[PDB]
């Protein structure tokens, strides 16, 4: 089972998963993954040179980040929100294309820098960045998950990991992954 | 303007509204909102334990769901249809009482579970469930709309939102809403 294999890569050997040691990390060039506090710190975002913010936890609960376009108005940062829940039931894969297109909107300019964040930068946002790496940068899920994890403590839920495995299957068979 | 405020809660920050990521969601306990395909999948309905189905898009066009009582005969599911059109002109509020009474017919039994569906589970059915939450569960429109949206991508048309605001006004003034 592929989800167990992905989990094995993420875990600390004690049955546990390390938590983010910083609020924000550049996980791959010009892509940052972070938490709610960094998303809400516009001066920090500006110093980092962030041009685009994808809120993958948009919403009103204690597990969401209650930002919107207007929060970023006249900061010059371009905003998109995805109202995802961090549950095995939430079909985040329905957003993989939407998110990859947004990341690529940012990166296809040479000065673009994108923050993909959620509440903790741990499950929802890392899933989207991993899917993007697979879909746009031709990384297999293990490679993509591994490079992100090396640069930030992450733990996508098992539902999200299974969605990434299904994605990997499709890209593999379609001949869209680097060997 | 109250409709704009409701829209702001629903939108993704790019001037757009996310579409349903699944065919069916339990939006509040024992109330499901879904599309035409789930309404027409009786074995799925049975596995979910659905006892009641409110078709809020009953009719014969490509924007309606052409089901009827006979479609559910001997499935043991109790059916009601409302031939609503998804337009700002359609007076869905004329059905708010009819629909709330049906939802409450289902929920007033402890094993009842109701699917309120339309063509996409996006505008007509979410409006009825929101009105029900306001009228029967004492939720203000913002609270009701927000809990539904957290559990399913929805976008009631502006006419429907205005009908919900008028409803909220009346319930507020009559002292029928939780502070």
Swiss-Prot record, chains A, B:
Keyword annotations of the record: Cell projection, Cilium, Cytoplasm, Cytoskeleton, Flagellum, Hydrolase, Nucleus, Protein phosphatase
Which SMART domains does this UniProt record tie to the protein? DSPc
The entry's active site is: 118
Disulfide pattern: none
CDD domains with a match to the protein in the record: DUSP3
Say if the entry is tagged with keyword Nucleus. yes
Assembly, per entry: Microtubule inner protein component of sperm flagellar doublet microtubules. Interacts with VRK3; this interaction activates DUSP3 phosphatase activity.
Which one of the record's GO molecular function terms can you name?
receptor signaling protein tyrosine kinase inhibitor activity
SUPFAM superfamilies, A to Z: (Phosphotyrosine protein) phosphatases II (SSF52799)
The Tyrosine-protein phosphatase domain extends over 22-173
Q: Which PANTHER family match?
A: AGAP008228-PA (PTHR45682), DUAL SPECIFICITY PROTEIN PHOSPHATASE 3 (PTHR45682:SF1)
* UniProt name for this protein: Dual specificity protein phosphatase 3
EC no. given is 3.1.3.16, 3.1.3.48
This entry carries the following GO cellular component terms, namely:
cytoplasm; cytoskeleton; cytosol; immunological synapse; motile cilium; nucleoplasm; nucleus
| Location of the protein in the cell | Nucleus; Cytoplasm, Cytoskeleton, Flagellum axoneme
Q: From the UniProt record, give one GO term of the biological process aspect.
A: positive regulation of mitotic cell cycle
Identify the enzyme class.
hydrolase
| Gene3D superfamilies recorded | Protein tyrosine phosphatase superfamily
Task: Name its species.
Answer: Homo sapiens (Human)
Q: Would you identify the family this protein belongs to, as annotated? A: Belongs to the protein-tyrosine phosphatase family. Non-receptor class dual specificity subfamily.
Which reaction equation describes what this protein catalyses? O-phospho-L-tyrosyl-[protein] + H2O = L-tyrosyl-[protein] + phosphate; O-phospho-L-seryl-[protein] + H2O = L-seryl-[protein] + phosphate; O-phospho-L-threonyl-[protein] + H2O = L-threonyl-[protein] + phosphate
- What does this protein's UniProt record list under function? Shows activity both for tyrosine-protein phosphate and serine-protein phosphate, but displays a strong preference toward phosphotyrosines. Specifically dephosphorylates and inactivates ERK1 and ERK2.
């Amino acid at each position: 089972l592929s989800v167990q294999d992905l989990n094995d890569l993420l875990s600390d050997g004690s049955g546990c998963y390390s938590l983010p040691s910083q609020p924000c990390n550049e996980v791959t060039p010009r892509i940052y993954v972070g938490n709610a506090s960094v998303a809400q710190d516009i001066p920090k975002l500006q110093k980092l040179g962030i041009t685009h913010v994808l809120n993958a936890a948009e919403g009103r609960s204690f597990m969401h980040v209650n930002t919107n376009a207007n929060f970023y108005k006249d900061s010059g940062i371009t905003y998109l929100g995805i109202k995802a829940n961090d549950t095995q039931e939430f079909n985040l894969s329905a957003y993989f294309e939407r998110a990859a297109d947004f990341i690529d909107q940012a990166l296809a300019q040479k000065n673009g820098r994108v923050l993909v964040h959620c509440r903790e930068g741990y499950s929802r946002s890392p899933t989207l960045v991993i899917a993007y790496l697979m879909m746009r940068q031709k990384m297999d899920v293990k490679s993509a998950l591994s490079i992100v994890r090396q640069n930030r403590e992450i733990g996508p839920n098992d539902g999200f990991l299974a969605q990434l495995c299904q994605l990997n299957d499709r890209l593999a068979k379609e001949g869209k992954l680097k060997p």
